[PDB]
Ligand binder design. Structure first.
Ligand SMILES: CCCCCCCCCCCCCCCCCC(=O)OC[C@H](COP(=O)([O-])OCC(O)COP(=O)([O-])OC[C@@H](COC(=O)CCCCCCCCCCCCCCCCC)OC(=O)CCCCCCCCCCCCCCCCC)OC(=O)CCCCCCCCCCCCCCCCC
Ligand code: BCL
Ligand code: BCL
Ligand code: BCL
Ligand code: BCL
Ligand SMILES: CC[C@H]1c2cc3[nH]c4c(c3C)C(=O)[C@H](C(=O)OC)c4c3nc(cc4[nH]c(cc(n2)[C@@H]1C)c(C(C)=O)c4C)[C@@H](C)[C@@H]3CCC(=O)OC/C=C(\C)CCC[C@H](C)CCC[C@H](C)CCCC(C)C
Ligand SMILES: CC[C@H]1c2cc3[nH]c4c(c3C)C(=O)[C@H](C(=O)OC)c4c3nc(cc4[nH]c(cc(n2)[C@@H]1C)c(C(C)=O)c4C)[C@@H](C)[C@@H]3CCC(=O)OC/C=C(\C)CCC[C@H](C)CCC[C@H](C)CCCC(C)C
Ligand SMILES: COC(C)(C)C/C=C/C(C)=C/C=C/C(C)=C/C=C/C(C)=C/C=C\C=C(C)\C=C\C=C(/C)CC/C=C(\C)CCC=C(C)C
Ligand SMILES: CCCCCCCCCCCC[N+](C)(C)[O-]
Ligand SMILES: CCCCCCCCCCCC[N+](C)(C)[O-]
Ligand SMILES: CCCCCCCCCCCC[N+](C)(C)[O-]
Ligand SMILES: [Cl-]
Ligand SMILES: [Fe+3]
Lengths: 281, 240, 300
């Protein structure tokens, strides 16, 4: 059904492929050519998960796991039973993720709005492809990619990390974590600021953006503004994911020893490298 | 044990939270409607919330949501199919008629005020001490359409005083009237302002404002809706 | 196609002294300068700031905490500036050895200095908290920032105060060091049998959920700023097409609905739930649960 204000916006057009063939809705959902492709890649993918669970011998959601090929398979294809399914599924998952993004472009065009959302979404699609495609290829085996299972994908995180000692010492991991931590701070403030102004003390009128800017200046001496906090939120979370892909593309490719040891370049700078005392020497 | 208790209690809290959250986001646009505007039979799982009332500043009354929703304007669209789900073709000019990406909403026909009660947006000629402080000053540059033709010249910048940002270019057309262009829909260049959404012959069609020194919320929507509509509707006149 | 990530033009007027309301204008500084650099992304104006008793109190013991750690760092560097810079990330100010329990009798060079700096930190933060509340109160605003801040105070309180007290010694607390506090973290998980089995850590991570939300939200408001969408408060009082199209994006995309106010409640909760659930999972680690792998083997 339709929101009270919605009919005036459901006009023909904005499609990228197909013209007016799939230009329609199903309940609230816009379909479009990439609505259909999403559904196709998604349903093909889910069928293959369930097949993988048949061969594995379990129907328990906390036990289904679809592993990549072994390392000795390098970058070739493996049999379905032993890593082939992961290969086909990974193709499907990508099919569905890009069709999702392209379908959002179409929704944007119909609505006359900017393309910022699919653009932001592509960065998450980037990160996924780093872990399942770009990193395995540079290393030379699909087996370095993570498995598709709820708890087993976590065991991969923990094993991969500890191959390099305390992964905390990856400098790109550090920056990535800062951006994640800051984005949440920023989000909490942005949410609290709007609500605190729309929902003032009992009996008082709605505050204004003047009150929002006054509050930040009184608090920290600077207010970034209402347009700028939205730029800030977009930028922080996009950078967070960017440096995540970065900390992972370099790990095991250009750097493969323990990450704590990478920091000896600083300590071993020649002008202070032998001054006694302190922690190092 | 105590940790099982903690995690069980949390999911129960989390569920009522999602429910609370889900119903706060029903305060605009409900109840759902059929395509002919009658109320839908299936309104979804969650009920509507007990209404809240905002006290608007500066003596402008209240707003209570959810409350009765009327588009408060005519919609020039016909059905293209015998069943739900399909587009609604425009019966006239969608740019003139304000449907599709050219849509506007019937907001108050008053200007947004700042915290002191003054007009929020003012032509810079009326905004004491305001000036362009960085970037290229567009005033005096000529405005170009997507058809690479010159529709007008920029005669002023309309500025948000409390937020100190440019919000509209005031463009003078060839008959001597002006129009407002959304600042987010133009590209200031060294020798020109370029408007990708409109071809030159659509500038005269931009909605005009009542008073020369103020712009109301209705007027802002009609202008902005019109200029975004050209991205779809003007497209038979855009070079690359 | 202009995309609104940076302003093309900057305009400037007289410095804005801000809303008055119930504020005490005596305690507002003068307006600082205008940063054009900042003005390509947000506002150019710096200041004025508000500083009162709680301001100074906070700001003073905040500096006292900072200096105390740096003093101990210089000690460790043997007062040599070259060693100080070389090993800046490696110094650390640790808590008292488990022997001293929850007592304050620990010598300075053996944990007493930790307890001092921690005291200043305790005062600086709780001061600043009451500062977020009283700054809102003076403008007549909701106390949403003070309650969201509490969620971050919760996790910080748990890590360095509540949980050490419950475990019966200060040694359980976090040290003051760059690499030093990274190791404490890794250690903590190893000892409690992998946190990845602490279901509050797992939710905490889900909420952290917030990069996703704030990506969507910022992208959307920029996408609809051609209709003046960044102006969310008046869009709440008087819905315009900016709010209409942003609602219809999420509805046509994934079928759920979001109002201009409604989505800021998603935002504040998505964010506060990070540190809230995180604090519970740390609070239970070692006090109630010794080993999350072993706990996960009985599901409870
Ligand atoms: C084992 C673990 C178990 C789980 C434990 C989890 C504990 C959760 C804590 C409860 C918080 C309650 C929130 C509250 O009072 O509601 C705000 C209330 C009003 O907010 P508003 O209308 O936006 O503000 C207008 C005020 O008039 C504007 O006036 P104001 O400025 O006074 O409003 C501030 C208000 C609004 O605050 C919020 O809405 C967000 C703040 C999050 C609080 C996080 C606290 C973390 C502390 C640790 O905050 C509060 O009232 C609560 C803060 C004090 C808590 C101590 O509405 C809600 O947001 C309701 C919360 C719904 C939760 C339902 C769950 C029920 C499940 C049962 C089945
Ligand atoms: C929450 C789990 C762990 C923890 C795990 C990590 C990890 C993992 C990392 C950090 C990182 C950082 N942490 Mg730590 N950190 C914790 C608690 C803290 C506390 C505190 C409670 O008072 C403080 C002040 C810090 C401070 C810091 C900074 C030195 C740094 C960047 C933070 C940031 O961008 O913030 C946003 C706020 C701003 C003002 C900016 N951590 C606890 C003990 N922290 C990262 C770093 O770069 O280290 C070098 C990093 O890799
Ligand atoms: C023992 C474990 C190690 C360690 C090892 C690793 C390893 C190994 C990795 C990380 C990575 C990350 N770690 Mg680390 N890390 C540790 C400690 C930490 C700590 C901490 C407090 O100590 C923190 C905060 C972090 C933080 C982070 C981030 C920087 C990053 C994860 C975000 C990301 O990539 O998103 C990216 C987001 C995605 C990939 C999601 C994409 C979603 C797709 C596009 C859409 C899917 C839809 C889906 C199918 C659902 C539809 C369902 C419904 C039907 C709709 N690590 C410890 C020391 N860390 C990872 C990273 O950087 O990856 C690039 C990584 O590989
Ligand atoms: C990003 C860096 C690491 C990684 C490290 C971690 C760590 C560490 C943790 C998780 C956690 C989770 N991870 Mg993982 N994870 C990675 C990549 C992924 C990918 C992917 C790229 O396709 C997916 C789908 C998941 C999925 C998940 C969920 C099971 C869970 C909550 C996520 C969440 O709230 O996100 C934020 C998103 C939202 C709030 C939006 C809604 C998302 C919904 C809930 C997704 C459900 C997906 C469903 C189970 C997938 C299959 C559906 C198919 C059609 C069959 N991870 C990589 C390898 N992940 C946490 C957990 O509890 O795991 C048990 C946890 O502690
Ligand atoms: C090997 C390490 C272990 C591990 C050990 C821990 C431990 C131990 C903890 C976490 C915690 C967290 N971990 Mg873990 N973690 C691991 C792997 C991961 C991975 C992953 C592999 O991908 C991820 C994504 C995460 C993610 C997370 C976060 C959800 C969570 C911290 C929330 C937060 O915002 O803290 C940052 C925010 C704060 C610390 C609050 C600070 C608030 C105060 C008031 C700020 C004061 C600042 C001060 C005044 C400085 C002044 C500033 C200047 C004036 C400018 N972990 C593995 C399994 N992780 C924490 C948690 O919640 O656990 C449940 C925690 O304690
Ligand atoms: C870039 C910043 C953050 C970001 C942003 C972002 N995410 C987005 C968007 C944006 C801007 C959207 O527009 C889009 C959306 O619609 O949001 C509601 C989306 C979205 N982000 C999602 C998830 C998601 N985002 C995450 C993260 C991030 N999203 C980043 C951190 C994570 C994490 C951290 O793990 C997840 C799980 C979805 C809710 C949605 C995209 C939905 C979608 O693509 O649907 C198409 C596909 C299907 C319906 C089914 C695919 C099934 C596969 C073929 C089989 C399954 C294979 C898969 C590998 C199984 C893996 C499971 C195991 C790991 C358990
Ligand atoms: C919802 C959880 C997130 C969050 C929320 C949050 N933090 C907050 C707030 C909120 C809602 C505030 O109101 C408050 C603030 O005023 O921000 C501008 C604050 C704040 N979060 C801070 C830091 C901080 N928050 C962090 C975490 C997060 N806070 C979470 C991700 C972290 C991390 C990730 O480790 C840090 C480092 C400060 C910027 C500020 C509290 C300021 C304070 O307490 O200052 C006392 C100290 C001094 C006055 C002097 C220090 C001297 C110098 C070292 C020199
Ligand atoms: C340039 O050199 C000088 C000296 C001039 C200045 C330089 C200073 C330097 C180098 C500063 C460096 C600071 C660093 C590296 C700080 C790092 C801090 C980190 C990483 C902190 C991380 C976590 C901290 C936590 C969790 C703290 C928790 C503390 C509490 C909850 C306080 C609890 C209170 C206690 C225990 C005592 C309370 C007392 C009473 C009486 C109630
Ligand atoms: C102190 C916490 C962070 C402060 C941020 C810096 C901006 C403050 C500017 C105010 C300065 C005004 N004045 C007159 C002192 O110059
Ligand atoms: C808080 C982050 C601050 C980032 C601001 C720095 C941006 C510099 C100017 C960017 C573009 C300016 N220019 C010339 C293209 O108009
Ligand atoms: C605001 C609520 C958003 C939905 C919450 C998403 C929950 C998925 C996380 C599942 C957590 C799994 N775990 C580890 C706790 O068992
Ligand atoms: Cl970037
Ligand atoms: Fe917002």
């Amino acid at each position: 059904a339709l929101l009270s204000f919605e009919r005036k916006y459901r006009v023909p057009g904005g499609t990228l492929v197909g013209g007016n063939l799939f230009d329609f809705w199903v309940g609230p959902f816009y379909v479009g050519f990439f609505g259909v492709a999403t559904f196709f890649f998604a349903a093909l993918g889910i069928i293959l998960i369930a097949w993988s669970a048949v061969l594995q011998g379990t129907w328990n959601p906390q036990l289904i796991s679809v592993y990549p090929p072994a390392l000795e398979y390098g970058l070739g294809g493996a049999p379905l039973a032993k890593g082939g399914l992961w290969q086909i599924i990974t193709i499907c998952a990508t099919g569905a993720f890009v069709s999702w993004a392209l379908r959002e472009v179409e929704i944007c065009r119909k609505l006359g709005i900017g393309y910022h959302i699919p653009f932001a979404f592509a960065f998450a699609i980037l990160a996924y492809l780093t872990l399942v495609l770009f990193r395995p290829v540079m290393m030379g085996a699909w087996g370095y990619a993570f498995p598709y299972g709820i708890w087993t994908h976590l065991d991969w995180v923990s094993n991969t990390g500890y191959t390099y000692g305390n992964f905390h010492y990856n400098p790109a991991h550090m920056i990535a974590i800062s951006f994640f931590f800051t984005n949440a701070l920023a989000l909490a403030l942005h949410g609290a600021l709007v609500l605190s102004a729309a929902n003032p003390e009992k009996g008082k009128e709605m505050r204004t953006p003047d009150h929002e800017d006054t509050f930040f200046r009184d608090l920290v001496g600077y207010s970034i503004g209402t347009l700028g906090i939205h730029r800030l939120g977009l930028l922080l979370s996009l950078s967070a994911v960017f440096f995540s892909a970065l900390c992972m593309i370099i790990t095991g490719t250009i750097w493969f020893d323990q990450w704590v040891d990478w920091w000896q370049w600083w300590v071993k700078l020649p002008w202070w490298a032998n001054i006694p005392g302190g922690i190092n020497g | 044990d105590l940790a099982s208790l903690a995690i069980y209690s949390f999911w129960i809290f989390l569920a009522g939270l999602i429910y609370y959250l889900q119903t706060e986001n029903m305060r605009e646009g409900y109840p759902l409607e059929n395509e002919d505007g009658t109320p839908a039979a299936n309104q979804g799982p969650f009920p509507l919330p007990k209404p809240k009332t905002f006290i608007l500043p500066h003596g402008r009354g209240t707003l209570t949501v959810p409350g009765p929703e009327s588009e408060d304007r005519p919609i020039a669209l016909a059905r293209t199919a015998v069943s739900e789900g399909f587009p609604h073709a425009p019966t006239g000019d969608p740019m003139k008629d304000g449907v599709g990406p050219a849509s506007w909403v019937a907001r108050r026909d008053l200007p947004e005020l700042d915290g002191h009660g003054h007009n929020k947006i003012k032509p810079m000629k009326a905004a004491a001490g305001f000036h362009v402080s960085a970037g290229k000053n567009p005033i005096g540059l000529p405005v170009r359409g997507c058809d690479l033709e010159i529709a007008g010249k920029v005669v002023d910048i309309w500025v948000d005083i409390p937020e100190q940002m440019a919000r509209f270019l005031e463009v003078e057309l060839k008959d001597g009237s002006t129009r407002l262009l959304p600042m987010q829909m133009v590209k200031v260049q060294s020798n020109r302002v370029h408007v990708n959404a409109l071809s030159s012959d659509l500038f005269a069609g931009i909605p005009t404002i009542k008073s020369p020194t103020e712009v109301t919320l209705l007027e802002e929507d009609k202008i902005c809706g019109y200029v975004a509509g050209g991205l779809m509707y003007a497209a038979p006149k855009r070079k690359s | 196609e202009y995309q609104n990530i940076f302003s093309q033009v900057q305009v400037r007027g007289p410095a804005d002294l801000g809303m008055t309301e119930d504020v005490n204008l005596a305690n507002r500084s003068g307006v600082g300068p205008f940063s054009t650099l900042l003005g390509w992304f947000g506002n150019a104006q710096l200041g004025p700031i508000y500083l009162g008793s709680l301001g100074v109190l906070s700001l003073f013991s905040g500096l006292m905490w900072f200096f105390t750690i740096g003093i101990w760092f210089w000690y460790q560097a043997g007062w040599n500036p070259a060693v100080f810079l070389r090993d800046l990330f490696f110094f650390s100010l640790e808590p008292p050895a488990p022997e001293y329990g929850l007592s304050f009798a620990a010598p300075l060079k053996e944990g007493g200095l930790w307890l001092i700096a921690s005291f200043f930190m305790f005062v600086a933060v709780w001061s600043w908290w009451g500062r977020t509340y009283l700054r809102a109160q003076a403008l007549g605003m909701g106390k949403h920032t003070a309650w969201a801040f509490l969620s971050a105070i919760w996790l910080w309180m748990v890590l360095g105060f509540i949980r050490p007290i419950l475990m019966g010694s200060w040694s359980e607390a976090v040290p003051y060091g760059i690499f030093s506090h990274l190791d404490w973290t890794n250690n903590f998980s190893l000892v409690h049998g992998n946190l990845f089995y602490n279901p509050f850590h797992g939710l905490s991570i889900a909420f952290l959920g917030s990069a996703l939300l704030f990506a969507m939200h910022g992208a959307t408001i920029l996408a609809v700023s051609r209709f003046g969408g960044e102006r969310e408060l008046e869009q709440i009082a008087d819905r315009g097409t900016a709010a209409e199209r942003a609602a219809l994006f999420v509805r046509w995309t994934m079928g759920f609905n979001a109002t201009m106010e409604g989505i800021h409640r998603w935002a504040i909760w998505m964010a506060v739930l990070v540190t809230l659930t995180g604090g519970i999972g740390i609070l239970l680690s070692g006090t109630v649960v010794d080993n999350w792998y072993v706990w996960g083997q009985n599901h409870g």
